[PDB]
């Protein structure tokens, strides 16, 4: 019982009306974990599996923890949460031989058990580099048991793997594939509507909140910016 | 455990304003920090390394919570006295201290030796402390979202905390407590030294901010200590052999300059990494030499980087200009472009070579002006710190350090011996580093310096670094005039019309001791000396550099001091003129 | 680098 | 017949300083404790020693655990190591360092030593278990709460600094770190005379000087071994029939002498401590070649003073600062002084250039050795490419690195036409351009060693951007003096009887069995026939042709040594050298 094995505790203050500019990803997340909950006698007409993996790949600040977050806080609800577990690939025990694998397989162990899970891997190139890669320390073990231990075809439940990296060349390519990561979503920093957005997002519960003029010249000053 | 606030904690005057504004006054002011829906912060890390300060800020935090009750109450426990033998009384009294939290509701929780409390659970940790963990996630993750209760953590070893706290919801907004700059050090010996009978002059707590690059304010505290040991120990020598108590008076007790350079050895220096350049105001000796040189390159520096009006925009605090400073008084978006995009056009290409003979005093004259920068931020590009080897090879050195110029804007990219450089980094490194400066817009405070002995100009005119934007900006240095070179050798020769009488050293103590109480002649040296042995070092040092004069002083100061002790200086400048030679 | 531990500590609790 | 418990501090010889600073922080704040507010100071309650292996901290401890206990005062001193704090309940070993820390505030004037510090408080890693970091935390908890008054003093003994944490290291928990060196040569002559102080028939001062002349490397440990060995040597030659008795011969210990044989015998079978895995300490000149080149080294010591200020400095070598301040009156803003002392150092670079051959490793060997407080920095091929992959440039700029911060230090190239060959030419170019970096005052010698060098291509060439300008010796080669007082030896084992050697001579008369409870044949016109053609051999010979025919006529002449008649010794001399 004794890992890195605790729930992130979610707030309900985040959900996907606080995120800005990436609809598709957010429409492409519902049929992912949430329908599935919903509406399991039509995933079932097919038998299909929806994709249990994906990785979100783009510039720091650009919301893929947000993402994943109001992702817990989003079919968290009807006395039915979403365990949301969070890693991270700059730990220091992340890169400890033989400690690592019993710590991610104790991390599947009880993602399978609190059964509508999320696991989110902050930095996954940390976690799974490229094994033909030119730093001496690099884990293949750790990256194999990484890769036999989530499966979106072996049945294990209902246990969402979602992995956060700014480039996905560094994460390994054999953890590109349907069964591991199904899906890749490239976080962009927003354009200057997208700014707008989120922009308005950050301001909306002030007293006197800005005019939408006040907004759009705000917009086009922050070029470069990312919404964090 | 003192009654120790703010003004005690020098170089960090900034950080109590930003935690104060992050925690003091949102858990003061409602009525104004939740107009703005900002939430403040479960949990706040104050990581660093040993000896900087984060003990002293919340003992400064807790001294005002000195204030009335039901305001900022202030709970100081450690990573220990909480753990304990039983099984429970740990993690009961962990939720009982967070209940009285949230009884008395503005309240902070500090947790000094965070690390202590909650490290880092794996197979070879304790349950007692993974259990505490366990609590301590569940009770932050309690608490609500208006939040009245702020819990502070301090660690000098921030990856040995549980990773668990550091997750959204938690232990997020970190404070970094770095080894202090020169003017903090400066501001910690001062805040040292302030409550002394005998009082020490601002210079010399200069000369000892520029000799203790490597230490915290704990290590100036305990030199300081020993500096007052040393000089009790000189000045009473009996107190030491006695095994009874004499009668000291402590008013003839004056801790010196010569104590401060013995506790300076006496003193481990903890991690000082005395490595590379040092940005160090030009030195006493040399300075006649190359003051208006260096003078001719601040004003050049000054309108390049137009020094002369921001000074980093008349801001390093911003409180302080919100209280003696009136601003002026959307139409105003229009106005603010204009005049910030006038503001930023002053800056183009900054790009300094300063050229000058072999041995012209450029190691002098580089840490001089990086002293006179220091709101710039100082990349080096020397070659004994790209191949310091970081398990990296030196192209991604390189380019990193120019990652680190471009985000920390002002800044500097300072490269010494550059027609060394020139022949040792390969020629590639040399281009990746012109297209990174060609890749870059016209209004980026990046100061291109570099310093060369005898560089070639058609090496920047048509060469490798034709590519850098040198076209206007060589700064030659002169060899020093004989105004210069005549000041120079003025200290020497009064270092000579110094009489034996006058010359500090340490003869035999002949005399008793004072045992306490149990409870006339002339330096022989005529002007006509003095004047011929300046003629002669001014003829003899003819198109000198700074080098060379230097050489010759050495070997003049050499033979001065040879004959210390002296009264008939004759043979002394029969041996000078003859050295001259 | 993986090495183990101690069987942990007995917890005699009893005086 | 163990090791000591009554040891006093004049039983430690060659740390004076540290001694007093212990005297200082275990009386004063006792006595005085104004002084300690009227400047608003705390006085250091904690000390760590650190250094080499045998090189005092046990030593010191124990001298002060007697002094503890001896005087009208008492100091109650606490002893402790990681057997007697770690326990296998979950917070018993925390409980046992407060116990500890609360029974030494009891009896409040008080020293708790705390040795091989290390192992009780190594460095807090999350890779270890935890009983580690708690006694670390627990330990900087109690240091955290003493007495505030100078009651409690901690002293730790770790033998490695970097092993114990860094949060006990900083001032306020362990405020002083006494480094004990490896002792130098004063420090070397006063351990050893007082390890031969209650010796019957004393040793002599000027053989102590020889004898601390050739022990560098020795600690404390491996001097007190030398006489140890020497002292077993000599009781198995006055009477090595104890050896084969299985009963107590009677022995008189007042017929048992130790002779000068016998400490250079024991010399050859001790390996000191800083030795007995790696290389040996640069060695002085040896015995047979001072002849050949000691006034020429001794015009080197001349140059290598004028230009470093050696004597003028160095008076007081980790020496009492108690003892300056009474043997010394000061005469007390005015610190241009130490602007001027520090102008006579300019760049010091020295380039001792000579022959092939010419004893030049020899030299720079003596030179080595005569620095001692300098630290030196090898930039020789066999340090830089010794350890791999490291890279030659980031050896380099590290042994830089560390010649300008624990100054006085020496940059040291020997065989300087190799190195400019046999290193990369960045190296070079990284040195010189590092060279060039420092102050004109900074005192990092750059000593540099070179056999046939091209001096047009040093003001020139690759070490043109070096300041070898006037500061470029000259070894040449012996001079007929030289040469003359060298072979002046080796006429000298010619001039030997058969019954004058000390050789393995057989035993007829049998041992003494205890009480149980003719003429040298040499004309005087041959032995200096042998000496006029051996000086008209040596011809312009550098040091080392000198040697290997020295080393040929020494062969020649230590064959025939059993007989009376060298007439047949000499005519093969003769021949030989022709
Ligand atoms: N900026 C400063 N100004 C003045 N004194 C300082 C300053 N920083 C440190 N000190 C002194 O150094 C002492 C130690 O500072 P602390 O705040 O206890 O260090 P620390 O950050 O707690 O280090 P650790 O991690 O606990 S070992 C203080 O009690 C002060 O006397
Ligand atoms: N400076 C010294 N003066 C006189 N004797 C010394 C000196 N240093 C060492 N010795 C002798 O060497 C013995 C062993 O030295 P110790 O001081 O006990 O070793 P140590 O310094 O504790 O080093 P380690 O780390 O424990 S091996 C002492 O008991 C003395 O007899
Ligand atoms: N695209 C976005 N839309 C809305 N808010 C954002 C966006 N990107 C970042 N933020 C804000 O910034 C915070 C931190 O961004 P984060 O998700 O940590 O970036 P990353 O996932 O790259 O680490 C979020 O909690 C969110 O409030
Ligand atoms: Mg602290
Ligand atoms: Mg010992």
């Not at chain 1, 365990?83 to 991610?104: C, N, P, Y």
């Not at chain 2, 990652?403 to 002002?410: D, I």
């Not at chain 2, 390969?426 to 990046?446: A, D, H, M, T, Y």
Request: a positive charge.
């Amino acid at each position: 019982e004794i890992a890195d094995l605790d729930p992130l505790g979610v707030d309900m203050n985040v959900n996907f009306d606080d995120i800005g500019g990436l609809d598709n990803y957010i429409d492409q997340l519902k049929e992912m974990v949430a329908l599935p909950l919903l509406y399991p006698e039509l995933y079932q007409n097919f038998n299909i599996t929806p994709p249990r993996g994906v990785l979100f790949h783009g510039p720091p600040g650009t919301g893929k923890t947000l993402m994943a977050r109001a992702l817990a806080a989003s079919c968290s609800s009807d006395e039915r949460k979403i365990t949301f577990f969070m890693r991270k690939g700059a730990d220091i025990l992340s890169k400890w031989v033989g400690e690592a694998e019993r710590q991610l397989r104790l991390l599947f162990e009880e993602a399978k058990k609190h059964q509508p899970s999320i696991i989110f891997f902050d930095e996954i190139d940390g976690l799974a580099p490229v094994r033909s890669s030119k730093q001496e320390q690099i884990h293949a073990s750790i990256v194999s048991t990484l890769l036999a231990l989530m499966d979106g075809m072996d049945n294990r439940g209902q246990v969402i793997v979602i992995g956060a990296t700014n480039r996905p060349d560094a994460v390994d390519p054999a953890l590109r594939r349907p069964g591991r990561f199904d899906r890749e979503f490239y976080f962009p920093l927003p354009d200057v509507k997208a700014r707008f957005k989120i922009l308005q997002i950050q301001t909306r519960k002030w007293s006197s909140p800005l005019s939408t003029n006040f907004i759009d010249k705000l917009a086009f000053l922050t070029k470069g910016y990312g919404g964090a | 455990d003192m009654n120790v606030n703010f003004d005690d904690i020098g170089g960090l005057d900034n950080y109590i304003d930003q935690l104060k504004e992050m925690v003091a006054l949102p858990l003061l002011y409602p009525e104004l920090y939740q107009n703005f829906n900002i939430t403040p912060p479960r949990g706040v890390l104050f990581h660093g390394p040993p000896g900087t300060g984060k003990t002293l800020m919340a003992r400064a935090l807790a001294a005002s919570c000195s204030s009335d009750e039901r305001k900022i109450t202030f709970f100081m426990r450690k990573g220990a006295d909480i753990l304990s033998k039983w099984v429970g009384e740990a993690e009961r009294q962990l939720r009982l201290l967070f209940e009285e939290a949230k009884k008395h509701q503005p309240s902070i929780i500090f947790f000094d030796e965070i690390d202590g409390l909650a490290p880092v659970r794996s197979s070879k940790q304790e349950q007692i402390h993974a259990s505490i963990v366990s609590t301590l996630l569940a009770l932050m993750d309690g608490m609500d979202n208006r939040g009245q209760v702020i819990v502070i953590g301090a660690t000098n070893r921030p990856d040995a905390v549980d990773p668990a706290l550091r997750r959204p919801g938690r232990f997020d907004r970190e404070f970094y407590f770095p080894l202090p700059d020169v003017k903090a050090r400066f501001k910690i010996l001062q805040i040292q030294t302030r409550k002394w009978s005998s009082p020490l002059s601002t210079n010399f707590i200069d000369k000892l901010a520029f000799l203790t690059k490597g230490y915290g304010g704990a290590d100036l505290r305990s030199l300081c200590t020993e500096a007052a040991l040393i000089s009790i120990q000189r000045s009473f020598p009996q107190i030491y052999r006695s095994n009874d108590k004499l009668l000291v008076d402590p008013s003839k007790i004056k801790v010196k300059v010569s104590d401060f350079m013995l506790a300076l050895k006496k003193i481990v220096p903890s991690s000082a990494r005395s490595t590379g350049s040092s940005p160090q105001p030009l030195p006493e000796l040399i300075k006649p030499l190359l003051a208006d040189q260096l003078n001719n390159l601040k004003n050049k520096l000054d309108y390049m980087l137009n020094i002369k009006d921001t000074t980093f925009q008349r801001n390093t605090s911003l409180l302080q200009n919100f209280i003696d400073y009136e601003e002026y008084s959307t139409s105003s978006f229009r106005s603010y472009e204009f005049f910030e995009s006038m503001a930023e056009s002053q800056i183009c290409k900054p790009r300094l070579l300063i050229n000058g003979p072999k041995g012209n005093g450029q190691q002098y004259v580089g840490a001089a002006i990086l002293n006179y920068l220091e709101e710039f931020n100082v990349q080096n590009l020397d070659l004994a710190s790209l191949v310091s080897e970081s398990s990296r090879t030196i192209e991604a050195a390189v380019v990193q350090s120019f990652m680190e110029a471009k985000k920390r804007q002002p800044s500097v990219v300072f490269i010494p011996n550059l027609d060394i450089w020139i022949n040792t980094i390969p020629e590639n490194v040399i281009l990746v580093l012109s297209g990174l400066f060609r890749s870059l817009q016209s209004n980026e405070k990046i100061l291109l310096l570099c310093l060369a002995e005898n560089l070639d100009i058609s090496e920047v005119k048509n060469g490798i670094l034709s590519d850098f934007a040198f076209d206007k900006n060589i700064f030659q240095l002169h060899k020093p005039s004989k105004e210069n070179i005549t000041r120079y050798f003025s200290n020497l020769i009064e270092l000579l019309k110094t009489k034996p009488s006058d010359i500090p050293m340490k003869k035999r103590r002949v005399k008793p001791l004072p045992e306490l109480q149990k409870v006339d002649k002339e330096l022989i040296l005529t002007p006509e000396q003095i004047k011929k042995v300046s003629a002669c070092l001014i003829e003899h040092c003819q198109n000198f550099t700074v080098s060379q004069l230097e050489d010759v002083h050495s070997s003049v100061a050499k033979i001065i001091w040879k004959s210390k002790s002296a009264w008939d200086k004759t043979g002394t400048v029969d041996e000078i003129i003859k050295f001259l030679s | 680098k993986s090495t183990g531990g101690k069987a942990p500590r007995k917890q005699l609790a009893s005086k």
